[PDB]
């Protein structure tokens, strides 16, 4: 939203991809290196998903909370 | 700023007033008048702190609306009027009299006196001028002015004033062996006797002093008032007679000297 660039982000958890629909809003976060750098075995991806539709992805995946609907 | 300043923040006010930092953001801005703002205190701080006789603004009003308080022989009705050093304060009901002096620490303090001491004050001579109609005049530190005094009085001398007549009574000059009182510096409130003066040109003269209990200290003439005709003082000084002690000396005097 803030730059009008399009970027690639990684989705962390076991079944995580199933918690996201097209046209959802997501908040995105850094991987923790000094400069923006690739981490582990993922080539060329520099951010990861944190929250979907205002709620924690960790809670969504582990079925502790539900989608706002 | 578009015009003159009206307020005064509490952290900016003189360290000589000795007001507690935490209680509120403001302090009373002294009215214009006799002494400088840095060398005087407003009357309402005296009545609420230095000599407790009021505890609230309603009471401070009432005391002065009833016309009770007299300073230098005139009744005062401005709560923010400045009082300065060697400045007789009195209540005619109950016949009380006080002078304003410094503690050894340099804070202000009121000292109770008899109705004899209440009749005079001391000031320092600042300028001499002749005025329209060929009238000689002389002026002093606290904005005083005097017509047809003795012509021999010289700039820098100190003069004693009769409060009832508003005339000069006696004159004393800056010489070896006279008593001195300390108005500003590292040694505020000390009292001592002149050892020696070193004259300088276009710059302040340096004065060397011996204390009554042996200590030498020197300062510039601009901080000294001369307070006796020769040997011994005019005004009566505080319960402790102007001796200052280091923390080191206070320890030696408390626990005894370090033995071999």
């Amino acid at each position: 939203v803030r730059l009008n660039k399009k970027v690639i982000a990684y989705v962390p958890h076991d079944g995580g991809l199933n918690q996201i629909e097209i046209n959802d809003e997501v908040i995105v976060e850094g991987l923790g290196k000094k400069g923006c750098r690739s981490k582990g075995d993922i080539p060329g991806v520099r951010f990861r998903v944190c929250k979907v539709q205002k709620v924690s992805l960790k809670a969504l995946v582990t079925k502790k909370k539900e989608r706002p609907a | 700023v578009r015009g003159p300043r009206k307020h005064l923040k509490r952290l900016n006010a003189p360290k000589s007033w000795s007001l507690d930092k935490n209680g509120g953001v403001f302090a009373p801005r002294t009215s214009t008048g006799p002494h400088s703002m840095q060398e005087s205190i407003p009357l309402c701080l005296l009545l609420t702190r230095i000599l407790k006789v009021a505890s609230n603004n309603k009471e401070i009003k009432h005391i002065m609306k009833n016309r009770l308080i007299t300073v230098n022989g005139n009744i005062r009705t401005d709560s923010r009027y400045p009082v300065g050093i060697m400045d007789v304060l009195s209540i005619k009901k109950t016949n009380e009299h006080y002078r304003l002096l410094y503690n050894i620490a340099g804070k202000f303090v009121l000292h109770k006196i008899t109705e004899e001491e209440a009749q005079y004050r001391i000031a320092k001579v600042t300028n001499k001028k002749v005025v329209k109609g060929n009238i000689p005049h002389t002026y002093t530190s606290c904005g005083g002015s005097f017509k047809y005094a003795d012509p021999s009085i010289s700039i820098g001398d100190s003069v004693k004033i009769d409060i009832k007549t508003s005339k000069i009574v006696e004159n004393s000059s800056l010489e070896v062996g006279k008593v001195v009182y300390l108005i500003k510096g590292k040694n505020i409130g000390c009292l001592g006797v002149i050892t020696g003066i070193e004259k300088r040109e276009g710059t302040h003269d340096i004065v060397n002093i011996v204390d009554k209990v042996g200590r030498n200290f020197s300062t510039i003439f601009s901080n000294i008032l001369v307070v006796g005709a020769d040997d011994n003082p005019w005004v009566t000084f505080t319960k402790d007679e102007g001796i200052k002690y280091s923390e080191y000396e206070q320890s030696i005097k408390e626990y005894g000297p370090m033995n071999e």
Binding site: - | E247, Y248, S251, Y255, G256, P257, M258, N259
Partner: protein, 168 residues
């Protein structure tokens, strides 16, 4: 945020160092303290006095040495911590005693705490039930209750401490 109040603990540089873990574990266990923060707080207090002694011994001038030595030694005597026959007005003994401070230990501060004093004076069966009498108002000093286990007892208060029976 920057705001009023000091911070009283220092976090250890290595979180899992085995000799530090074992020796800390022992001392919390023996003295019946709540968590590691109680201990670390006492440690900082102890370090501060050790720094003052170091500074005094290395100072060049005499006025500061003679002045501030006395103050340090008198304070630590009043707390009941540094117990020896310091003589004043004698330079050598002041130096000797300053050197004895330099290996003071946190154990000595712990044993001045009210929780330990109560148990040590045989008014309670354990360091645990001592704490449980300081809570619930059973402990009283100079005719007034003290609610806080960390109260450090000065030298000679020991005559005035007391316990009362429970409210039930």
């Amino acid at each position: 945020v920057k705001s009023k109040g000091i911070k009283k603990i220092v976090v250890p540089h290595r979180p899992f160092e085995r000799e530090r873990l074992v020796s800390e574990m022992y001392i919390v266990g023996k003295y019946g303290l709540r968590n590691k923060r109680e201990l670390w707080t006492i440690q900082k207090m102890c370090d501060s006095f050790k720094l003052r002694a170091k500074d005094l011994l290395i100072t060049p001038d005499e006025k500061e040495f003679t002045l501030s030595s006395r103050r340090l030694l008198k304070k630590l005597a009043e707390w009941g911590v540094f117990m020896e026959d310091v003589d004043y007005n004698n330079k050598q003994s002041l130096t000797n005693n300053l050197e004895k401070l330099l290996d003071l230990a946190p154990t000595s501060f712990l044993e001045r705490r009210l929780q330990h004093r109560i148990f040590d004076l045989g008014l309670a069966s354990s360091v645990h039930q001592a704490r449980a009498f300081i809570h619930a108002r059973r402990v009283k000093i100079n005719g007034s209750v003290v609610n806080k286990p960390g109260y450090l007892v000065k030298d000679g208060e020991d005559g005035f401490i007391e316990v009362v029976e429970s409210k039930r």
